[PDB]
Design a protein around this ligand. Structure first.
Ligand code: NA
Ligand code: NA
Lengths: 266, 253
């Protein structure tokens, strides 16, 4: 299984991703459809041999609160020596449910410096819905992970170039930049702090978001328009310019269309 | 007495007077006179422990302004703050500036135009008011300074309520001389550039009932957070009763 090999990243980074995906796949095994991506979407590369990638999408079934779950690793050798590695898993719920989504993402281009994003993005306006802030974020101590990771001297806040991106993450989101010195210290951070944190945030999404009133009429619609506004804008700003470049045009066309199709975006 | 800011440094007084006078000079015709009983403009705890001044100027029924609130607070702590609140007639962002301080060389600053509709639902709102206005350049710039560091609110609610360009910052200088240097030269310009974007920010009804209960939900929450707990244990159960009345009446709860 080429996806699950995570071939360009460190053993701990790999292990974190394998464990996260198995847990999701095993735990949602009754609700997930078999993955459906054509062989040339599950894996692809830039024809010139300098970018390669892998995608794993499982849609939820008809009575399931899951829309889909997606994992990916991207490797892209930058011409200016440095080499970018992205690994991410994201869980998306549908409007039969108001609960938060899941995101974890590790982005790296230095050997001892790495961006972590780990969150449970909200699907309701948190200022209109203090009750929602309370059940999903306060009563949850989701914040203790952010603060704890922050206590490390190698860890600083990461703030997205995109205003849209800052605004779509929850108030407890861990958006962190790690770096120091030896890469052995990085590995120790990954292994001793980032994995436990990621695994636990996944447990809360699985136990508290997925497993669950019953969502009425006008609330169901609000969720659809908000969710589809998010995906639509999130794709255009990150996919359409990055993939064309990284991968070249014909392959970007194929994958973006499949990603768009998985996401529900026209 | 409000405009004296008696417990903050000269440069703190200078800022807050400049800002409030700007507000009051630009809006001049859209604000009704102050109408607080004088025991609410000014009050203290029985013993000298705590004083506070408030200044509330309602806009009239036909301007875009719901109200403007000014205040300074001191206990044993120094807080000075100027909020601007718009009514339904307009979808535009509010204004908040706030300086919290409990040292003499370290100081929290919040400075923002809080959004009045959901930023993920409305990316068009986002762009109009936040990207196109360069508002983030302020926090970027302040943060370049070796003394300034992200502040993060302990309250998950207040984190929620701030826009993504919000300058929420902790300033920690070696000597308080060097704090006033930053205060006079970085904070002050940024606060006025930001206020300027709020004022020189120059259509209909069910868009408006949304603005309404959203505005009310923030207002209600943002006031328990503060004045139901913190005020009675600072000024005494009784004083806090009438000023929470005034505040709650002005805020519309
Ligand atoms: Na740190
Ligand atoms: Na700084």
């Amino acid at each position: 299984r080429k996806f699950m090999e995570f071939p360009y990243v460190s053993p701990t980074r790999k292990q974190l991703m394998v464990d996260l995906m198995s847990t999701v796949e095993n735990r949602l095994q009754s609700q997930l459809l078999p993955c459906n991506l054509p062989p040339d979407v599950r894996n692809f590369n830039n024809p010139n041999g300098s970018a390669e990638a892998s995608l794993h999408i499982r849609s939820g079934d008809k009575s399931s609160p899951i829309d889909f779950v997606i994992g990916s690793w991207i490797h892209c050798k930058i011409p200016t020596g440095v080499s970018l590695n992205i690994t991410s898993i994201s869980g998306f719920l549908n409007s039969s449910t108001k609960a938060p989504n899941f995101v974890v993402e590790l982005i790296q281009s230095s050997s001892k410096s790495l961006v972590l994003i780990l969150d449970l993005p909200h699907r309701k306006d948190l200022v209109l819905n203090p009750d929602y802030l309370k059940e999903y974020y306060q009563d949850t101590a989701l914040d203790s992970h952010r603060q704890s990771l922050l206590k490390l001297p190698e860890v600083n806040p990461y703030v997205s170039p995109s205003l849209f991106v800052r605004s779509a993450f929850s108030p407890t989101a861990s958006m962190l930049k790690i770096d120091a010195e030896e890469e052995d210290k990085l590995e120790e951070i990954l292994r001793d702090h980032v994995s436990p944190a990621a695994k636990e945030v996944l447990e809360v999404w699985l136990e508290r978001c997925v497993k669950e009133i019953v969502v009425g009429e006008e609330e169901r619609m609000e969720l659809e328009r908000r969710d589809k506004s998010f995906r639509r804008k999130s794709i255009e700003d990150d996919l359409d310019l990055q993939f064309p470049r990284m991968f070249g045009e014909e392959v970007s066309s194929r994958v973006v269309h499949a990603i768009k199709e998985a996401f529900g975006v026209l």
